[PDB]
Symmetry: D2
Subunit: 242 residues, 4 copies
């Protein structure tokens, strides 16, 4: 009786989810796991990679926790070479991660997205199928410098994603992004209460978003039903736009 929904299944796909040790990234690893995919979650530290592997086992999800530093050509090549040998090619990839800091931050994020994306693309090109999904940063940054950073990264993410989607379309690989708003995370929990209350007041739905609410959007994008969606940045912010 629930059988129509088997077409949203990711049975037989392998998915790589960076920064999967907590919050949004973790909720995504579990959602893709639950949809049937084999899931490799990653972290910068060995302890995070352990936490991921534990978390996956505990939720009945085949896969692994690995260490990955997207700023390193070496770590990227190595991690992918490992995944292909032990688990399969990842055809679903989810990238999750002062006044003057904005430029270096955007420059670093996008050089990282490009490095990882380019590496997983050889596999997706051979398969003539792929899903690349870039997760933007959460709203909350304190003060003007934080607004500048957030807005810059969001503009860069959206133009990048659009462009890469044009570059890889003919190979039936989609490239999309998700732009969260005020989501309940460790980072937003550390905002002082006055600023949390002020952000809520600007959200039409009147609540913070849940990590799972980002993950579901990601899960849909990864499905065969989202196949004509590419180059898009989907905002998940309860109606609060900048």
């Amino acid at each position: 009786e629930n059988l129509y929904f088997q077409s949203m299944s990711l049975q037989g796909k392998v998915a790589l989810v960076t920064g999967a040790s907590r919050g949004i990234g973790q909720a995504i690893a579990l959602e893709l796991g639950r949809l049937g995919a084999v899931v490799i979650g990653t972290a910068t530290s060995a302890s995070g990679a352990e936490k991921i592997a534990e978390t996956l086992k505990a939720n009945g999800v085949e896969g692994a926790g690995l260490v990955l530093d997207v700023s390193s050509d070496e770590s990227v090549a190595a991690t992918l070479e490992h995944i292909q040998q032990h688990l399969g090619q990842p055809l679903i990839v989810v990238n999750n991660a002062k006044d003057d800091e904005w430029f270096d931050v955007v420059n670093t994020n996008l050089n990282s997205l490009y490095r990882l994306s380019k590496a997983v693309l050889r596999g997706m090109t051979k398969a003539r199928w792929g899903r690349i999904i870039n997760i933007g940063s959460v709203v909350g940054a304190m003060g003007n410098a934080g607004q500048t950073n957030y807005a810059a990264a969001k503009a860069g993410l959206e133009g990048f994603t659009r462009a890469l989607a044009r570059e890889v379309g003919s190979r039936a690989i989609t490239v999309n992004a998700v732009a969260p708003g005020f989501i309940d995370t460790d980072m937003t929990r550390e905002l002082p209460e006055a600023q949390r209350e002020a952000l809520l007041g600007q959200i039409p739905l009147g609540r913070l978003g849940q990590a799972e609410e980002i993950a579901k959007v990601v899960g849909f994008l990864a499905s065969d039903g989202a196949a004509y969606v590419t180059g898009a940045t989907v905002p998940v912010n309860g109606g609060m736009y900048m």
Copy 2:
């Protein structure tokens, strides 16, 4: 567990302009996700076609006649639905010359507003709702057609954003879907040279299928899209204009 977030079991959905193409594909998708579905058309023959189509696909619901330009037709059709089927908590609005753009947008948005306002009582009572507006398909011939398309798209997106702000506190979401070059009876009328030129501008290298719109709509209608509101989701294979 994965489908508790996808199911529309026990929801009622109203889908305008459901007699063919995109609207039809959406009626069927919401049906298949478990909703009771009322599809509508401007003519009695279209309303028959809808009801036939629904029965043939194993979907409980109805085909009705609805003219979104008429306060009377709207009030009447809703009354009928509440009495016979339940309150529609999912509503999907689907439905030249140089100077026609302004009237076209004005008419589209007045129609969206009229229908949306009427279904909002029901949603407010339930503290739950999904409104979803479907934008036009790419294909329009010449410069006047481009002006019309680009205006309607900008209007749809601003409108959707504003209504979403207005109704958010009641856990009703309002989103839109902006299709690109989709295979419809209208795009099939395009001569081959123009189809080929449009394809050439689409990174995926193909026209979109009506079902491909409908899946996006099905997702927006789900509980998993609950924090998505005010958004216009483009479904265009990477061709942005």
Copy 3:
């Protein structure tokens, strides 16, 4: 010298004070003959006085852009007494549901006035239509909804009309101000003023003259390849 509006006639609606006034004077000073308008006869007197006092040939008239009759009438008067206006500048606690009627009314007004002045511009094969958006300041969430809706509608409207009239060398542009020093923004309570200022990188309110200078440029021959554009003048505060 090069940015002169010598020999052009300009119509500037809502010109009796603030932004509209500053624009009337700026175009006047650039050499144009200027007709400023107001909803009231007293405003129209004030405009005509203000123009004389600054050495600007033109007139103050009464105009209600919501009325087909007031529009047709005011234009008929201007053509008969002063020339065809080839530069036209449209200037002119809320509840959660008011946005739609407000936008609908603003844009129906822009369309009405724009369509009417277009016959003149078409004859001349030259024109400048310039739409001024509303000033930032609106109180609460309903006001933000309204401001954002009007701004989106202004931009799309301006783009579309620009496509329609381009072949006749008429440009259509808009100016989207931010937090400008006006009578209306002066009456905002201090907490809201302080909060807005804190969000402006330049760290100050904008002056009416600063909007007017942008408008003056758009009206010039040097802005001839600028059309369909909405130019933001907000000290770096975007939303």
Copy 4:
């Protein structure tokens, strides 16, 4: 008012087309103008062009990709001509996979030059930075991708830098041209030219001087409350 009397302006990539038209416009508005090029011959051409138009200034060699060339060229300008408080960044087979490197390079170059001229502008508590985007380069899909990526990057960058430097009364804006007369557009056969013109509501290509006038206005005191903006100068053809 509109005069740039007493200002010094640095204009990169000034040896021809848009950059040249801007050098001359700022010159004619009264500024002292330093135009720059990657080559010594271009720098000669600039200096010749300035003298011929009655504009005090100089032609220098500048490679915006080099920290050394940047530091050196600024040093030279400060010593001989004054601090440049108006800065206009213009500078510079097509494949669908080139967009990233192009944007990464343009923006690293803007950042490098902008950061260097900011000390001067901070000390003066006045400045104008103006970034010129790329005209459309090629009619393919790849030409669209590149064009749209550069433009998106330029806009976000300009917006961010404007937020960073606003308190010091420095404005940062960009100008996004559409189609100007180029070798590429000159070679379009009549049918394709008509179709390109047909996508431009004004029905013509834009002149370098038309970009330059916009720049001149942005540089003036009248544009003081305009910052973070990208002003499109494309005859009504919008593309992204």
